[PDB]
Nucleic acid binder design. Structure first.
Lengths: 184, 184, 184, 184, 184, 184, 184, 184, 184, 184
RNA sequence: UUUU
RNA sequence: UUUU
RNA sequence: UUUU
RNA sequence: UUUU
RNA sequence: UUUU
RNA sequence: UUUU
RNA sequence: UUUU
RNA sequence: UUUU
RNA sequence: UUUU
RNA sequence: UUUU
């Protein structure tokens, strides 16, 4: 009667929820890495956690880019850091070179330091569609923490991040994120 | 091997417990609505909760009425507000009219805004049995909250209440309540 | 051929018996805890014991309340102290608050320090039935002792008690108890 | 499909962990009792707890003795107090007499007030092996608490302790303990 | 074809009948024991017997209490004396102490000297129900006699009695009894 | 696997033993009744008892008669008093008339007040065999007591006795008795 | 359903317990014999007995030796005297010669007068491990007594003893013993 | 025909081998972490590797401690860093506190940052065995690297290390290590 | 029904027993051979024999060594001489060379002149454990004799011996032996 | 009927035997390699061989170390040279470096030039056990020779050796060896 | 078959 | 069924 | 099914 | 039967 | 089939 | 087999 | 299989 | 059939 | 049936 | 199939 137990088990666990929004950021040619799961801190509220582990049932990422001054490209890489030891990964840890066209870092991907959840490229044209967006929903996994508060040192194995990189410094991008998780 | 899993699952979950007492209240001809599950606030103690959900395994209500000056009637309606959005329901939401003999509000019951758990009427006579009481134990259900503290705004879908209404303002009634719940 | 062995085994064991009576006690608003199984002391008579263990086959409690001066309530809680280390439990160990309407202590009940055998409330009215009584018979369990004589220090795991609490200090209550036990 | 459910259930529960160390204590001829599980207090961190119950999946005790001045014996008794009501057990509750060679208290063991997890005796010789140690790992059980903080009054049914007793007051002993537990 | 024979056998045996009434007796604090089956004496009439044995097919007891001067309690214990040697049992043979709240005599009940058929307690209140009654019908058993006439010396193994005891000497009680028996 | 359990149960129960001797008694024409099981009193020794019940596994009676002055007859009736209420039965309770040739009392035997274990008559001749004896061994049954010491009032249901009666007052008889019993 | 009955039978029997300690004894070249089960005397306490038989469920012996002045050997022979008639066995009854290296007495072992439970030899060196100890736990058997008190004359078939013998008179040895037994 | 393929596959792969020795190190009270697999660098020799991955078939660790000046303890923890990002782990990452008696770091073990292969404690006594050693052989797993040379930055997921910590700074310890691995 | 006959046969045969002790012997660098079974001579006692054959059911050897002046080694070789013709074997018959480190004589072992039962080496250190011992129990075989008395000429096929050899002449060794045999 | 043939075949082949002893050698920090099977030369005696092949059925090695001046370590590596071409292997052929803590030579072990039979390390302490020994017995294999006499040039594929290496030059070690072989 |  |  |  |  |  |  |  |  |  |  397997799989039916999975259903019953989850009906006894509270599905806590955490929402985040990050608007009006500039496109970055050298790229940046944004925290997504870090915001769930130790506490008793619906968007907090008990202990240093949570299990994401599902999470959703919404990304948006707006071209300014020149038509440009925005790339967003949603990823899981399977081996985080209390840091916010650098762009070069994920990409071979710090360029929006770069392929993944051969070494970190070989050893599975990261798992790419979604890699999205939005081309925003000032002579066409200057505003573009994408929403992605995916089932989640375990998230471990190394601390209680919303600081880099608290990120742990399973931490969720988003790398943004593009070919201009003038355009603006927005993002929002939601995680539904159990905390038993 | 179903139903056996239900047993095992619960053996791994702490059955927290919350107790409440509300003594020496006056009988109300227009009625009043008392909070029962609201008292379980966010915290780490045995009678508190993590997050905004708990699952009542069982709960018990004890009601008592004492006639004073004149023989009178005390009515106690134990109910669940399946759709609470952060309030303490009014008497008229539950009863068609604000009278101890009234039937339920046709509209709120049709839409199942409330689920009546037990409706008890105690007739206390100053020429007979002037003191009467009733204890009721029932299995519970999920309780959702809209906030962390013991205020009306924190009541949510599944909140438990008790409406008291009678035909005099002089008699005194007492009540106590216990909820055994899991908080995983 | 199980269950048939249970029958045969008991036919070879003497079913000793102990009787107790406790009349004319005042109702207590703060409550009191009375000893029931403590009276079976080490000795060779029919109502005594060899060693520090006996197995209650069945026991019976008779409680009675009589209103005096004012109509009042008498509550009697028959219980087993599963973890007694040589004491007579306090009222607050059993009840959340020292009030006749109180629910059980959340902590001691969660950990199963006590097992409630029967909780009886008698409302005695001087304008109605001023005298009320209740007799309850139940199968018993193992009783461990921590000493040889009838003192608090001899109570042990499985000791049987009765808590009495009410809303007046003037009424009078009576009780009697019988335990049928094996002592092999 | 039993036993497989046990596996799945635990994969959804955070296995919190608590570590403790107690170094440089003097050997005691009258003995002492040390707290082991008491240190897990109410809170939101990885080594804390929600409510008054936790379930130890596994725990480990490390004991060490060093002879000083004279060759001597160190005894360590790892035990569970199945009936703790908010205390640190005394040596005489566990041992018949307060001597390192004593057998267990007949009464408390008969009634199963305690469950002995491991009884270790280390003989440290100043003409041989003056330093000895032992590490023991065992599966755990439920632990109930009677309070929120790290004080004796918070110990409850299932509390874990270690009794140390020897034949000298001069030697030094060290100990450390780890508990892996679920807190759902 | 068993059980069918039981039916046929009884159709060939006369079911004799004996009726008795005992009205206007005072409540007794020290108690009294009344004869019920003793009245069936040797003779040829419908309510008499041949020899020293009869077999009660069924018998019925009706008890009634009326409070006088003060609200009071009436207790009636219907019992069979399995070992009567020509006497009317004393109150202390049946009850541990001569008090209406007393439990049964441990020794006589252990050895099964008596079999309790019904134990009834009626609380009569001068501020409520001052008159109460109870009728009980039960299948009977063999009754042996030690003599021919209606005197104590004629009671024998199986004799039926009723013990009455209360908390006042002023109230009045009434009783009546009927026995349907075969006399083959 | 029945009957095998009977064997195992008894291997766990101590088979206590009691021995008695009664020598040099005169033959009695009116008869006398001697106590046999009464001598087992409350205590902790091998020939004593805990409580008011024992179960005789087996018992043995040895009787002897010696004619003196004239050839004469000695009768010994070994019996169980199934309904003893604290007495030593009289000769007339057992025998129709107080004569060594008498048949049993019709009334007491009809109601099974007594169970005859063995009825022995020894004719001792001064011109032949002047000395005669008989030893009888039989399985036993439950023995109930009404007190702790070796007095008549302690005899209870199941008590064992021996009636002696003859046709002369001059001859001498001796007897001895042994009871093997469990006392669980 | 055998073996299951053994389990059930024992659940109805009190497992009494007796503890003993014997510290600071000198090593003996001619040997000595110590009593272990003799200390359980007739009485009503948890470490006493009813009658002259008990059944040891399990027993444990703890022996310890400490070299003094010279490195030396301590031998401890735990044994059961299957035929004790009220004595403390002599060393020569157990050993062929009174020497710590001796083999068992050929005659007493051939006839099974004794059953060796454990034979332990501890070599304590003043240039190495000067302190050594051994704890042994074993299931027990029936123990018969010849008297009520703790004197040699009370030892009987099944009595438990410990013989100590070594190669010096200066070293010191300690021992402790526990017996868990039924006494039905 | 599974498992047989595993055999055949390995017969086609060269089992390269790497040996290391680290002698004459001082005991460390704050502890140190030594590299074991780091020494396998990129190259074409038998003890080198192609690429950034190797699969250890088996590896062996030999540890040794020698007491100097004072009797002391040496602890060696052989472990795998499952998430290494180019570092030599610190003592505090593995142990809760920097003490030889400390339990593991609760956080890093919860998230499985490390896998303990073997935890060995050697007590070296200057009055007994001053020199002690232990050799351990275990099957291995995948080893990922982050660089080509023997520097900390080259350690990667699966890197093998050994933590040494003790209670003195004077004693000396030695170690050696061998890894047999495939490099296909 | 084989093997069951072996059991029955032996129950009809007396298991005679012989004990021996040999204390305070000096360690021998050239070695010595001691007689073990030779001591069983023709006679009628429990430790003697009828005829020239006995069958050892079981035998036990206890050896002990004590270092004196210098730390040294004691070797004890328990063996059976399968072909003895009336002698005490020489050391060179058993060992290739007369040295405590020597392997067995190639020729005598090839032809199975001897069967080695146990070869024990005890290293006794004056800076550690200066006293060591070993007890060995083994099933036996047939023993043939060539004479009636305890002299070398009486040893025959199957004779049991013990060779002792060491690296010093100063240490002292002790031994004892027991043989349980049938003599039908 | 396989495996049974192996038994029969060997019963027709002489099991020749060779014994060797090598006493009083100094511990070597650079190590040495000793010959074990080389001593079996061409000839007709029981410890010699016909031709250049023998098959070792079983062989045994006995090693011993004695600390002198300083506590020290002795390592003994019993091995088979599967590819010997007429030499006594060097220490560096077997060990990576000439140190007693060294792991095996990666190259020679990879190619299976040697097969390690047993690797033993003995730590001899002048403050504890200064003398230690180990005896190892193992089944053997084919042994090929390259010559007729006991010189290095005669060693061939399968030759047996023992490498000794330690951390001092002062201690003394002894060894002995036996080989049982067929020579058909 | 089960039950005080 | 097997075992001292 | 068996076990303290 | 399976699924959020 | 069972039951007063 | 099912149940707090 | 049954029995003190 | 399984295993370094 | 298997084993030195 | 079972297991941390």
């Amino acid at each position: 009667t397997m799989r039916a137990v999975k259903r019953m088990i989850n009906t006894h666990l509270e599905h806590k929820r955490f929402a985040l929004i990050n608007s009006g950021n500039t496109n970055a040619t050298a790229g940046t890495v944004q925290n997504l799961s870090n915001g769930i801190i130790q506490g008793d509220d619906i968007n907090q956690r008990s202990g240093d582990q949570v299990r994401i049932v599902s999470h959703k990422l919404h990304v948006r880019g707006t071209a300014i001054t020149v038509s440009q490209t925005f790339r967003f890489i949603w990823f899981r850091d399977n081996m985080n030891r209390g840091t916010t990964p650098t762009v070069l840890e994920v990409l071979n070179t710090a360029n929006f066209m770069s392929q993944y870092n051969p070494i970190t991907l070989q050893q599975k330091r990261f798992t790419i959840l979604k890699d999205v490229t939005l081309n925003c044209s000032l002579t066409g569609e200057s505003i573009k967006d994408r929403i992605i929903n995916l089932p989640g996994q375990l998230v471990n923490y190394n601390g209680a508060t919303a600081v880099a040192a608290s990120n742990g194995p399973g931490a969720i991040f988003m790398l943004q990189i593009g070919d201009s410094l003038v355009g603006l991008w927005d993002s929002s994120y939601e995680a539904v998780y159990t905390d038993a």
